[PDB]
Amino acid sequence: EPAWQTRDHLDDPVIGELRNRFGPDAFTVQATRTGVPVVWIKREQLLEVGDFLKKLPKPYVMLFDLHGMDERLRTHREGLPAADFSVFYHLISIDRNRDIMLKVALAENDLHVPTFTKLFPNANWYERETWDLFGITFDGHPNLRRIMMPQTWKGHPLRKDYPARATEFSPFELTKAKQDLEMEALTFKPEEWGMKFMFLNLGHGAFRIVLQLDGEEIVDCVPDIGYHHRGAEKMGERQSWHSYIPYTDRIEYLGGCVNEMPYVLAVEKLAGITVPDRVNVIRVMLSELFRINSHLLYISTFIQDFAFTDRQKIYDLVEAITGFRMHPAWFRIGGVAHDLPRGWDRLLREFLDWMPKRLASYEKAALQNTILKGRSQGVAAYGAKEALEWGTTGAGLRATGIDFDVRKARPYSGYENFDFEIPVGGGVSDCYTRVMLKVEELRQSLRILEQCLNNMPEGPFKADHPLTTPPPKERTLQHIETLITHFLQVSWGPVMPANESFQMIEATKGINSYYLTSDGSTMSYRTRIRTPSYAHLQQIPAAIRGSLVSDLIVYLGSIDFVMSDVDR
Amino acid sequence: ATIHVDGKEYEVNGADNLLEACLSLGLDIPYFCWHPALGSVGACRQCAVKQYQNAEDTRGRLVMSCMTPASDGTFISIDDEEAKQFRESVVEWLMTNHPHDCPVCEEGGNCHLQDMTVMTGHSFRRYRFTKRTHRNQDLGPFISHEMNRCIACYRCVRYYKDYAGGTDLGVYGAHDNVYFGRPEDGTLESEFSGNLVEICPTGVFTDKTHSERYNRKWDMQFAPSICQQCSIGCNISPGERYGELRRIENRYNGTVNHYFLCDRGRFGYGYVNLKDRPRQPVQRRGDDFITLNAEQAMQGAADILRQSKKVIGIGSPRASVESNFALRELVGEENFYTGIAHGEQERLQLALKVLREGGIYTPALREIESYDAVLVLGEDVTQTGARVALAVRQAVKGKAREMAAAQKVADWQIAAILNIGQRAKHPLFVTNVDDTRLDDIAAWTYRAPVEDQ
Amino acid sequence: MYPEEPVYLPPRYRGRIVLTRDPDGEERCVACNLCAVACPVGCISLQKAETKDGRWYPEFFRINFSRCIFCGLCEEACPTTAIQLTPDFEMGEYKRQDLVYEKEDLLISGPGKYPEYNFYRMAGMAIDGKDKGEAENEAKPIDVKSLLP
Amino acid sequence: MGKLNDMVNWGRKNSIWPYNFGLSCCYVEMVTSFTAVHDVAASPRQADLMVVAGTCFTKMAPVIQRLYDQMLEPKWVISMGACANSGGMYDIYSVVQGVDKFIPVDVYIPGCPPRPEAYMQALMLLQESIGKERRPLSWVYRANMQSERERKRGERIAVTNLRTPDEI
Amino acid sequence: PELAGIKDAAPDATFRIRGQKLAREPHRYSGRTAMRANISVHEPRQPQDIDTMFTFSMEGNNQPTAHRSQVPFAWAPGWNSPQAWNKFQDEVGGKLRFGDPGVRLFETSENGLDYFTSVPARFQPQDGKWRIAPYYHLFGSDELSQRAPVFQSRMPQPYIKLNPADAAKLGVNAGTRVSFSYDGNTVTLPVEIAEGLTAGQVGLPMGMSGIAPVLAGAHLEDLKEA
């Protein structure tokens, strides 16, 4: 049975529990290719369903995602409630190792949903962004303001009737914005930002936090984000399925092929493509190389608060394979762009004969440096309860003792074939614990690369599916059917039949996920990108309360976030 | 009627064939030889579905949906594996001799064969032998000929001969060396030969005027417009690129000009691209020609027109209603003159009085095809109103349609209709000062002066 | 060590974009506009012209290199292997207008990374030096007037 | 007098302190530029070169404008990457399409991201531009330099064969 | 008031399909940052269309299931050819979905006209006066079509049509150039013999170079061999 097949998930026990609790007519089950049960809930029963799922015997504990969707232009709404807009809530149970997506339908004039911040505190920023980009009001929300746009912004950019392109530049708006931003330190209003003692602005990426200090103690802090908002999802609606891969690259720019992976896996779910095993091994190999690179940068940055030669070795290897250092744009729908060059195994063998000594040096620089142990342990720590309620994933969640990694819990791209361990922390997410987990993850990625190098499948680098985009180049250059497929795929776009797909992977900073809605066209009807840096940056005001500003700086350096990943 | 496609129940018209019924519902069946206006002949064998005898039937039988009536309680399957394999096989058979030409083919990105090759999911070539080739003909200034790309679907000959009434385009040859074109090099003699660039599902017949300044369909900026070349008002899609009008495509209007233009409308757009057109306001000063912008021209013209004692306006039947009205508002109603002669205006006003005061319904252009007898008085329609001549040809073929409908033959089974109606046709009586292009189908032609007509 | 020691670039490095020529010495671009539409940034603009023999070529071809992200999707789109990304990165300029490379700035005098592929040796359309039936895997055309059954 | 202006421009070109105000991936490439494997070898008030390396968002644009205004003459600007040149691949509502919409730019670098040797090449280009122009000695006519495109045209068009992508 | 139906011919400029305008160009429109790059590397403004409901970009609506009658082009995913019009109709080969564009200005009148009693007399050929019989051409009788350079190779050379009896009376054969004076202008054309033309009439190509359509039915004087 294919893993991309359109399933209904009626055999999920959560569906039966919802039927026994709210009745069979209280909700509508939608058959998707997301791999999760999609349940359309009435708007009034939303908080009741959230309460019921929070109190299950193995409860749904993490709100993985929350975002809106403009359904006014979607033509294939068969088996769906009549909706002008919808809001989807993606909830994850780790005890069940399952997840559910609750969709709430909304009419065009009555665009208001009850707030979800009483159940899941991390819904605050998600509801702010859903208000910002869709105009969906949330009743009961404390400060429902724009999070990606300036407050003096007209319209909601993710609505279908909003112009995607840049408008005409005006120096008058620039001078007005200079007057607005440069008078903020003089005419600050401490009630719009949600606060209620000196006010400071600080000014991984450049971003501003508004701090409220009692002496040097932090009594309140509100981050100001959106300074690096590139409109990647609106571009997802503007590019074809094939010519959007560079945009997937440019989110979490230290990830590269790691960021390409969930997008192409979701598109392959839409296309019904089961890639061959060599494709899986190649994509795993490149994602592990980029994971090692990102972990090296994170460890070197934390130790700073010699290590840039190994990054150059990884960049040379990726340059040899793909042709580019940090934005390879190399994964394709149904495979990868080119085959591995002849001589890649020598470069990988020379890299794996260089890394054990460097890794031992990093362990000596992190373990034996007891000054770093003293200045890192107990610096803005949290337990599993705070990690679940804020959507913290990756190294922080596993440092809280919760053994949840996507590469093992919900395996993808042939990670089952590789023997590697998941490092789990003691139960407290210190800076030191997270750095040690990154070191052990680096060791496990080296083990994965060794298993790739020693056992490499000899086979195709693109699938034998008609929707593999583009087709293999030599058959394009000498076969008319293949030439026709290449012509239509690179120009009009490949046609994905109307469905919804979801792929969640373990990124270099946490859990990254794509949620794609196709309306049967050559572009995406909706592209939703869940990035872990968003949920990690939301957790700062919940952990740095009552601490020093230096503790805030160390915690910011130990979060492992990138600002382009935050503002996506 | 009631049909069951892939286990789902649909209500369709029982007079339709299965292909057009399923295409109306939104179901995708590949097809080449069928066209909505030309009927069904069952040549290309691309529209295959599996028809079951009843609800509890498992074997089924591969039928052509264009040749199969959409009768009540008809069980078919489009997405069955055997039907999909046969349709992919037909695409592959068409691909065995097809040239490696898509980058250098004017139909690329606009090709029905490309779309149906992708739609059937055929992308792997396992044919390894030689491809048959052909030599092209010169078809004149408008239609370019590239016979290598032909899939032998007979749409061109069916349109040009049975529908358009042309006589200089046929199918010649045999088993798989079938050739489509003229018996010799020369210009296609039909006034509706330009519709071959959209009737042909491949790049055999292409728009040569578009080919000289070529761009792909995705690069076009289109708009819905009305053809400005005669009075019929056929809807067109002009597409431009780089500031010049590149192509006139047909724009569907089921009331007026459904699938077809004439060659004047399709190929007489090149006046827009002339380099001697006025592009700025120009005011003469002695022998000089000073170029003004918009506001300077308006102020200077307003000053001189304000000083003049009486300004009159001369409109045109080329200009739109808004422009003639704006001139009439500028100069006044009493100072506005239609810029046509007195006799021309008298004939136009009499025609208007007949149309809107004669108490007789004036049909739309598609509705002309449903009339049982045509009398054409004085109007050489093929040279002045050509789409009406095409509609008149369809109305003349209506007698063969009626005779076949008397014998319980479906209206889309066009070959049987033409077999039953051999040379019988509805009456056509044309009068002109000389021979018209409708004389090949007219029951009588009267060559006489306008007084005698 | 720069510009003292030249930095090694791998052969498939995505740097400066060139247009290449066939082994016969003619430019490979048939002006099919696949690279222009496959560009996610829209920084390729060209126009098909056609010589007397019927050969398609670009009348002009321009790339805005202030806008190009060097993603190589245009080279992946090219059915003639005309457009290629070379291992060259030194493309800095003083004026942003001088980053708009016209056809004479792009068309090198050789085949580049693909030294033998010739699209017009495979295409069915007739050009000079290659009549009907002279492409690869093509039979000579059989006239319908021929005496064979 | 003639040698004095030459020595003044020589002093300006041999001592350039960049304020590398980068915002994205291009800034991280410039962070990798400072390492000993590339050998590339403050405050806006004493810096004389502004290297804009990254996407100029509609919210970051006042910051870039203010930080450029805080600098003092003589001041030079190098745009790095497609984002700073033109907006790059983000022709989107929230991105200013090029940093030269609001501040003048002296040297542009194509790339996404440019490698650090391209930044060293742009430093050489800026040094030549500085050494060719002349400014008043005490209390501005920039030289119209030949474009690198037409200067490098002969050796670029003369290229015939390249290493195939199959090997390494 | 007679032209009051032009209001409903198309909707006004405020018409939107779920808030967005109608697109003039396909979604995969290319070259948007290089089509004017030779003039200036800076992109210009997108042209604002305030007159109509269409937009000068792809930021618009061209869905087949959109409640409109004015369709700029047919395109559906999977259907790039002119067969994409099948998705834009209520049934294939029938009306456009949500109606065809355009409205009739006048309805059929309740009562008709009277019979026109002005019956003309039989045509009589008098000597020295040639009735101009109009011959229209599809390529060459419409003015702007004549201006199109591709019609120059397609339009025929201007031949003046003569009856065999009239040409025999003039002594003129097929091809000899004859001159005739109209409005004090002697113009010469080569003669083509028209059998079906009646005697006393002379055939002229209306709309072509120098021959206006107003000459249809006008008399001709001084038709001699040139």
Ligand code: SF4
């Ligand atoms: S007719 Fe169609 S399939 Fe054949 S070469 Fe042209 S575009 Fe390609």
Ligand code: SF4
């Ligand atoms: S020339 Fe075109 S329309 Fe005619 S049979 Fe061949 S493919 Fe069909």
Ligand code: SF4
């Ligand atoms: S009949 Fe021909 S000239 Fe007249 S409106 Fe239609 S396409 Fe145009």
Ligand code: SF4
């Ligand atoms: S490399 Fe990418 S951005 Fe540059 S021209 Fe090619 S497709 Fe466009």
Ligand code: SF4
């Ligand atoms: S894809 Fe290749 S052949 Fe086609 S226009 Fe571009 S460079 Fe030329």
Ligand code: SF4
């Ligand atoms: S030009 Fe490319 S690498 Fe540089 S900031 Fe923009 S997206 Fe990042």
Ligand code: FES
């Ligand atoms: S479409 Fe039915 S056989 Fe051709």
